[PDB]
Amino acid sequence: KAGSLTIVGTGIESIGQMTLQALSYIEAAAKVFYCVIDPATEAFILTKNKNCVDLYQYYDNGKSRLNTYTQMSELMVREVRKGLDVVGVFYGHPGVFVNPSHRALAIAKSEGYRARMLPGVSAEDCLFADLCIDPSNPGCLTYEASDFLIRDRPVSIHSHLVLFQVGCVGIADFNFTGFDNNKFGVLVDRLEQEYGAEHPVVHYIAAMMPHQDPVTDKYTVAQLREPEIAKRVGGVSTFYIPPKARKASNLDIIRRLELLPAGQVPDKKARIYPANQWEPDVPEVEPYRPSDQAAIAQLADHAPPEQYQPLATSKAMSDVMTKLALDPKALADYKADHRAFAQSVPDLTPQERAALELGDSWAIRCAMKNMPSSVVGVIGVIG
Amino acid sequence: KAGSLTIVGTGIESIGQMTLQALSYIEAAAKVFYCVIDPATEAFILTKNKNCVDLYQYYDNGKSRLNTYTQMSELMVREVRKGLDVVGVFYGHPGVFVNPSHRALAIAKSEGYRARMLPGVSAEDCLFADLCIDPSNPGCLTYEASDFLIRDRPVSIHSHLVLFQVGCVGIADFNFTGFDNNKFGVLVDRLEQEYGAEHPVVHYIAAMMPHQDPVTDKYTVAQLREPEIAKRVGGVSTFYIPPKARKASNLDIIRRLEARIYPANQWEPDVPEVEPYRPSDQAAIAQLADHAPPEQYQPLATSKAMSDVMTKLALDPKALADYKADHRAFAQSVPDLTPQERAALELGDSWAIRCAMKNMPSSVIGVIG
Ligand SMILES: Nc1ncnc2c1ncn2[C@@H]1O[C@H](CSCC[C@H](N)C(=O)O)[C@@H](O)[C@H]1O
Ligand SMILES: Nc1ncnc2c1ncn2[C@@H]1O[C@H](CSCC[C@H](N)C(=O)O)[C@@H](O)[C@H]1O
């Protein structure tokens, strides 16, 4: 069947946080539907495709968001049924707290059209970067604020907590001026029950324009009841709640994992630098210790290991691999006939020519780097 | 004070998943430090800046990663101390399950230099897109697999669970050939204990090359004890465990405040099919017949010169620096803006620039969730 739907994101900050593939698919699209919240990004989109319709006009005062979301999705699928290659655009990540994207893709799939979502940079990604925290340490809980209340979602006082849509608690509608967030007190009551009146809450707004600074204002739970503070929390506000304390290691698991043998007890409180700047009364960890200093001393005599594989490729091969990532029409051709496409690319080496015809990951990477005398695998664990 | 450190990401799929701002900062850098795991992306970066060093060479067989990570961070901050503007590059999101970026920035921050991280597209972002799930519904738990076991982190059977680094449970070092993931069974035991033997677990590997398909294989917890299946789990493997059931509403809270949504989670066990066009949907679709923009709706109405300059600030890191360094001189230096546009750039306030670019009727909200 002719016709496809691809949904892409623009990221949070104006223009700069759009990915290269999102841009290339927008330019190649036959018609574009977008929902963005900054004018420079909107104007930028209109420079890349002449046949765009702004989905934001389907919100309205006192109109259920469900009705808006249903309308948005059908407009996209209508152009798919006419056999056209359609691109939908939502700011941030288009599948993160976005109802209409999943709806439209699922309909297109069930009806038999090609359908794919390309990921983007979400508001939580911005949060990790600007607050300088990692979801790995000590885990991350992510909830919708109203759902968090209505279905009593468990807190974990030892992990990160991220809450979206704190500016429209219990509110199912839209209003152009703003929300009367008069049920905000119900969230605050729950956070006090779970965390205590003096536990920190960080009010986070990622910068939308390139020259702006983010807001990273630290409050207590109790401070959130004061009227002048509550009204600063709006439609682009997210909360970050840091852990209350550190969870103890399970002795039986350390033994089963063989990190310690039969009779040994782990070094409690061994903390990895750096410490969470937001956790209350978290102590200072020293960036340089004897163990750190000895690792640094080896930097003097360090040379590349034997089995380290430096990149060794060609202009033709780099160019074609770049082209596949940035040229959707070239990618479709290669996927149509791996061999035929590879035969038309000039100046590849024989090993390059065989790797491209196969297209397998193992063959091409061996083709593009130098092999130390010893099939080659993939390991990127920096966490 | 002179010297800065900017850390950026490349996303997961080669090249295409890099952000525009990541590219411009790489090109502008005095020195570039990169850590990527695909060859096309490495080659692409090396064309865009001519002073790069590959950090990957500080791993080694049998070497603790903590030693490598301290080395990676020290290499960068030493050049910052010389007063240089340096950018570090890590694949995916440069702050998601990556240790040395925070360390290097924290050292730089302690010594008084400007230090910033630019976000990228993580493997979890790819998971949501390829598995067609939304973190909003019904919430999402994300853990490091070894931490999950050692600290006995709580599960929630009604929310999404995502586990990173399942291919090296309990392994603190590195090897070029591969991990012998022989403690994987302790993790499988925990999953059986929490969800039961027949609950689904989807093994996910996002495509790294643009022509590749993702791995999206659905297995029961019990099949993960077969040898031939366990060896499939490697250094780029992530697990998604879907919810077992739907949690009841709090009857107290619903009234204190003033049936499933299509579509259903395809991966949940024993969850019924939903109708996409219920009658309430069809009435909203009926509203298609005659619709116009609302009265307070603000259509975009800007100029080429204005759109161009705001774009330049997003795509030219030095121009941004010049603007931030001196609002007054830059705004007046730009030709062809109207009187309210140049004044709006001199101000820099969010409200002013927006008024200059949008038609306001006679008189920031983006909730699609
Ligand atoms: N600039 C910003 N800074 C912090 N949070 C933001 C934000 N913009 C939107 N959000 C959050 O996202 C919610 C809207 S739902 C849209 C989210 C978007 N798809 C994304 O990828 O992030 C808001 O209620 C708010 O909680
Ligand atoms: N292609 C892929 N598909 C699924 N998970 C992946 C992946 N590549 C890396 N990962 C996950 O990331 C871990 C490495 S730690 C690096 C994570 C990276 N910074 C990011 O933003 O995603 C791996 O153990 C694996 O769980």
Residue numbers in the entry:
A (entry chain A): 8 to 381, 403 to 411
B (entry chain B): 8 to 265, 277 to 381, 406 to 411
Question: What did the paper state?
Answer:
While chemical methylation of an amide bond uses a strong base to generate the imidate, OphA, the precursor protein of the fungal peptide macrocycle omphalotin A, self-hypermethylates amides at pH 7 using S-adenosyl methionine (SAM) as cofactor. Omphalotin A derives from the C terminus of the OphA protein, and it is the OphA protein that methylates its own C terminus using S-adenosyl methionine (SAM). The structure of OphA reveals a complex catenane-like arrangement in which the peptide substrate is clamped with its amide nitrogen aligned for nucleophilic attack on the methyl group of SAM. Here, we report the structure of the peptide amide methyltransferase OphA including complexes with cofactor [SAM and S-adenosyl homocysteine (SAH)], cofactor analog, substrate, and product.
